[PDB]
Design a protein around this ligand. Structure first.
Ligand SMILES: *[C@@H]1O[C@H](CO)[C@@H](O)[C@H](O)[C@H]1NC(C)=O
Ligand SMILES: *[C@@H]1O[C@H](CO)[C@@H](O)[C@H](O)[C@H]1NC(C)=O
Ligand SMILES: *[C@@H]1O[C@H](CO)[C@@H](O)[C@H](O)[C@H]1NC(C)=O
Lengths: 50, 57, 9
């Protein structure tokens, strides 16, 4: 295991889907809120007694 | 353009992810976009330009 | 680059 700071850990994953990593850093705040926001809904999806 | 930025204490370099092959930072292997006002973790440094030595040479 | 310099020095 080699430590990789999470900032550019996502960046390489973006390179793996044909997206330039420059967009991520310019949109780091938006992605973080979007990721956390999604975690909010997924929790309620299971808690909704479905 | 490829790999990540590394520094042996004070001298920054560019190397591929899966091996340590440090190289001098250059415009050819580092695509530039935007300005260093929104990226978190930017580091001030000069980027060697191969054209300048060739200019007037 | 070499021909470019030669074309215009
Ligand atoms: C880091 O690497 C450069 C590259 O040659 C070298 O000059 C320098 O002594 C090394 N150490 C530090 C602390 O910069
Ligand atoms: C890294 O984290 C430390 C403390 O957690 C903080 O002081 C520093 O500004 C951070 N740097 C970057 C580039 O995020
Ligand atoms: C980096 O350079 C900019 C402009 O040259 C300057 O405003 C800033 O204070 C420098 N240092 C940083 C960003 O740590």
């Amino acid at each position: 295991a080699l430590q990789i700071p999470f900032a550019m850990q996502m960046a390489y994953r973006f390179n793996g889907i044909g997206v330039t990593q420059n967009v991520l850093y310019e949109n780091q705040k938006l992605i973080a809120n979007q990721f956390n926001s999604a975690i909010g809904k997924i929790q309620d999806s299971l808690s909704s007694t479905a | 353009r490829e790999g990540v930025f590394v520094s042996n204490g004070t001298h920054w370099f560019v190397t591929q992810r899966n091996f340590y092959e440090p190289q001098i930072i250059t415009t050819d292997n580092t695509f530039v976009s935007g300005n260093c006002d929104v990226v978190i973790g930017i580091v001030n440094n000069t980027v060697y330009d191969p054209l300048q030595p060739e200019l007037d040479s | 680059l070499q021909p470019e310099l030669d074309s215009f020095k």
